Write a protein that binds this ligand. Structure first.
Ligand SMILES: [Mg+2]
Ligand SMILES: [Mg+2]
Ligand SMILES: [Mg+2]
Ligand SMILES: [Mg+2]
Ligand SMILES: [Mg+2]
Ligand SMILES: [Mg+2]
Ligand SMILES: [Mg+2]
Ligand SMILES: [Mg+2]
Lengths: 275, 87
RNA sequence: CCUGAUAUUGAAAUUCGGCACAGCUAGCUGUGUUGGCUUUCUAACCCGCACCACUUAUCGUGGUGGGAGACAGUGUCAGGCGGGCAGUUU
RNA sequence: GGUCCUAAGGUAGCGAAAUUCCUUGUCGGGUAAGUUCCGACCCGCACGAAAGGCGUAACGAUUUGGGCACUGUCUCAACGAG
RNA sequence: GUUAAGGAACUCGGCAAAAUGACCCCGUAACUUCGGGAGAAGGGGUGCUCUUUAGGGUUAACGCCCAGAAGAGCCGCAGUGAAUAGGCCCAAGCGACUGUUUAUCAAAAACACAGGUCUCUGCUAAACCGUAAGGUGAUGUAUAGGGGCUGACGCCUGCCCA
RNA sequence: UCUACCCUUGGUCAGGUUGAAGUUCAGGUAACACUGAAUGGAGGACCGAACCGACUUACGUUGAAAAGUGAGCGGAUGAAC
RNA sequence: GCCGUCGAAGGUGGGACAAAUGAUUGGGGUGAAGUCGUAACAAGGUAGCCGUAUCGGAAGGUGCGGCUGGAUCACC
RNA sequence: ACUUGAGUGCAGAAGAGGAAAGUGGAAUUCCAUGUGUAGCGGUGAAAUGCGCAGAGAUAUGGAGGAACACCAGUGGCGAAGGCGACUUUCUGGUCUGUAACUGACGCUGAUGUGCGAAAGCGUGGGGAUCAAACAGGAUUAGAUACCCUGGUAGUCCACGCCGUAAACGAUGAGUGCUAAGUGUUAGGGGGUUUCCGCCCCUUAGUGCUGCAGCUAACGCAUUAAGCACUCCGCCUGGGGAGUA
RNA sequence: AUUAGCUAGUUGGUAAGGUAACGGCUUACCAAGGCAACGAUGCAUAGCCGACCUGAGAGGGUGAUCGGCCACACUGGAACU
């Protein structure tokens, strides 16, 4: 779980780490790594879009198979490694063709697993097979959205989904945010819940390791004089004085919905969100 | 639990005396074959406590048989400690 | 930004109202014409959807699929929010 | 307890405060002597619960009052060197 | 640079100076998040010469460098004898901390912060730059991303929807 | 080419000091298993130069310098330069 | 007569325990009941009581568990 | 050396004794459409409220979470707190009959240590019903009161704590002992074992009625509050006070 | 016992010195012990026995004159015959 710390310093007063007991073979595989230069919000004009980014520690992207091809070949699981680009851990499967690849690792996985559409396809944790071939009440993750595209929905650490039922051409999926939604019946799904479940209790504990992860400070609005934030200065501290708290570009940020009338999402979203 | 087709084997390798189903030797040997098997239930299950009252009960029974055995035989008391590992 | 009206924009339907009074007992029936709501099919259009060629380029165009489909994107017009921004008065 | 009215019409906790005009509030401690300081009272001109309320070990080239130590800052100045 | 007697009486204010300063020892309170407080405070000893003995490594060993104990003795006003090196204590106020700020009259009690919440986003995501193409968000996908307020930890956060 | 964040590739920090997790041995355990002694070398940790800053004060103010020198002062294995 | 070991009293400093005292301050018993309500003992008119929370001027009221030391007809 | 106490072996049953994992039925609430439509509720009386924008009634639908009708009774079990749908793997103790077995191996327990009904708290999930706090209508001279539709922390699970109650049989444990009748539950003794027929007995829990005895009285009375033995815990007028 | 730890020359050998003699009796190198829930250590109250008082006795309360023993001399040390 989480290994705690003892308050020898005011920095390490309440800091709490995440114990690396589910990591085997800590060195990577030197044929599936691709370089990853950073950018802090610097698009193809050099300007600054999205704020609060940049710096920290160098990384190196690790090529992940989200497609789950190579039908009907038994894949062992060798070693469970660490991945900095994302919240889950990672796996190193070996297909019997000697084609070593990476899989995002579900909850308990060391044994050896199968990808096949409908042969028997062996519904267990780690096996990917399309949603027409999955019985109901079955916790899946890493679903595709468009057929043959690649697994998109629910890829986090400790995330999941749930197949509810089967409609006339689609299936019916309950997502992690609590939003029932129709997905086409030939999208794949890994069966299981993705591992590394103790992730959101990692108390960072210090403004320095919240700072070498690629985060910069975020100055509040009411301390900017009114050239650049609609919560401008005033003498002393001040209540906001608007009918609605505003983002730094005029739009009200506290309450107003933002999505627009969109193609192939109104006829599919049955229930909305629950928050 | 231990069955009564395998409990009888526990007696035979601890027969310093001949044809005795109850001794300061043989039931103590049976109790250890349960303590080593109750305490492996009690390294998988922990919320129960009625077993952990039977666990406390059986050992203090042996601590009275062993303290009787200290006060009869000099080299049989020390043998039974050395034979199973139990103190 | 939001929302209508038409253009690109086609067929199949099923009901529901305004006329028209067509039957001639407030409401029935059923034809000639008008405006809708829906429902389904594919031929435009659309895909930051899969292999395949130009090519030993995750750009592009060309090609059988699979999705979505006369809605969306877009052009003209019209209404409503709009100190996010401008010109000035006090 | 009566009664007017408002959409209900200041709860726990703090209180002459970085918040109190009059005011140098008032009684206690500190000094030979204390408009500043510390502990209390509460009649809050006008504290108050995420423009957070009340406490707090550790940390400060922070701000305010009192002790020992040391001294030309001082009573009171004099001499010498570049 | 030094100074008789006195030592904050000076002054907006102990401002500038003066004292404390090294190593080796004995000893150390309230208070607390049990790590801290703590160099807490208050104290003692150090120089040179001579006699004995126990301590590593190097080496066949005389030889060489590293050291610590008691005892005996000598001299000066003074033995880290010159230069270099913390003053400390009691009680409050604001901010938890290290950090960062007005290049050149303001370094803070302001800004950040780790944590608490609230709301928006089902993926060609919302958001932002750009008339558009293209990009950032991300080769990430609700344990993840953009924004509003409060600012560790502890105990808590009361009524009103005209 | 100064400064403000920022991307890719390098460089630099004398020394000395406390002693976090763990691991091993011993003591008790066989109950609910926790005390000591060694070893290990943790940290926006403490004292201090280079190095980076600019708190108090005196001088300078037709300056030696359109922002500085004298005595002191803070950070110094990182949110560093 | 001088030198040295041991040595009361004195002076310096941080603590440890009781006692005397102190602006205000919180409950407690005492009376005499004037002030405000009836919470128990009859089924005391909402049956009481023991733990444990939360609210109110005032006894106290409600929630979740246990007890009869619970009338009627003892709640068949 | 002895075998009545205490322990095991073998022969046998009765269990809501625990702990993980599945699985099943009936009711409550909320979402989808119809037929349908002015009332549904609530009450000493009434409303506040939901409804006419189509509520309740009424059907299929599907979403959840929680308890576990009938058996169910005096029954059972665990040292207590307590434990009632079913199936599965793992897991303690008690009892009946005794051929066996070493041969007093005991009882009590100051500190220690481990389980503890509910409420409450900490960090995470999930939230139908009931529902402190809370707003509302009237009952009241006054009303959180009692009464009514609403309602959050909480209720359920996993982990770590706090340990109190009318935690009660208001009766501490251990051994032997002394008039008897009547039930009930799981076992053993005498029958052709008549099957829930029967009486005849012996042992262990479980309730009722009742001598001698003891008691202030009530009432216990073989499961003693009787006669004795051992060891432990506590009390010494009522408040002040389980407070400082 | 609403006080649980306590002494450090403290516990012991050894050495020579030291008083009528034994002696941590006072000093020196080594050695790891003393005491303790059977009350060790620390506070407030006290001269103590033979006897006096009361009591059916067992016990409770007392310590004066009278005898035995003990300590002290306005206060705190140290000696000499
Ligand atoms: Mg303007
Ligand atoms: Mg200091
Ligand atoms: Mg201090
Ligand atoms: Mg775009
Ligand atoms: Mg500089
Ligand atoms: Mg600067
Ligand atoms: Mg009970
Ligand atoms: Mg509970």
């Amino acid at each position: 779980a989480i290994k705690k710390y003892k308050p020898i310093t005011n920095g390490r007063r309440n800091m709490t780490s995440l114990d690396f007991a589910e990591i085997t073979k800590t060195t990577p595989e030197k044929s599936l790594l691709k370089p990853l230069p950073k950018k802090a919000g610097r698009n193809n004009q050099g300007k600054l879009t999205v704020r609060h980014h940049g710096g920290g520690h160098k990384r190196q992207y690790r090529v992940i198979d989200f497609k789950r091809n190579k039908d009907g070949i038994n894949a062992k699981v060798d070693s469970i490694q660490y991945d900095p680009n994302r919240s889950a851990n990672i796996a190193l499967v070996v297909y019997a063709d000697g084609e070593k690849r990476y899989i995002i690792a579900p909850k308990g996985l060391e044994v050896g697993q199968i990808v096949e559409s409908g042969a028997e396809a062996d519904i267990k944790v780690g096996n990917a097979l399309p949603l027409q071939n999955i019985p109901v009440g079955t916790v899946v993750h890493n679903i595709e959205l468009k057929p043959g595209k690649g697994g998109q929905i629910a890829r986090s650490a400790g995330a999941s989904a749930q197949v509810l039922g089967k409609e006339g051409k689609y299936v019916l999926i309950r997502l992690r945010s609590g939003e029932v939604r129709m997905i086409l019946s030939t999208c794949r799904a890994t069966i299981g819940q993705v591992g590394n479940l103790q992730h959101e209790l990692v108390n960072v504990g210090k403004a320095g390791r919240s700072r070498w992860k690629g985060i910069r400070p975020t100055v509040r609005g009411s301390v900017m004089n009114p050239n650049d934030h609609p919560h401008g200065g005033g003498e002393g501290r001040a209540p906001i004085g608007r009918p609605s708290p505003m983002s730094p570009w005029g739009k009200p940020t506290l309450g107003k919905k933002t999505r627009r009338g969109k193609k192939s999402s109104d006829k599919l979203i049955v229930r909305g969100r629950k928050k | 639990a231990i069955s009564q087709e395998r409990k009888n084997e526990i007696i035979k390798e601890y027969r310093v005396h001949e044809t005795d189903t109850g001794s300061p030797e043989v039931q103590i040997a049976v109790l250890t074959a349960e303590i080593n098997a109750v305490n492996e239930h009690l390294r998988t299950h922990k919320k129960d406590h009625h077993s952990r009252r039977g666990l406390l009960k059986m050992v203090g029974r042996r601590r009275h048989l062993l303290n009787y055995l200290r006060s009869k035989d000099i080299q049989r008391y020390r043998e039974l400690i050395k034979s199973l590992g139990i103190r």
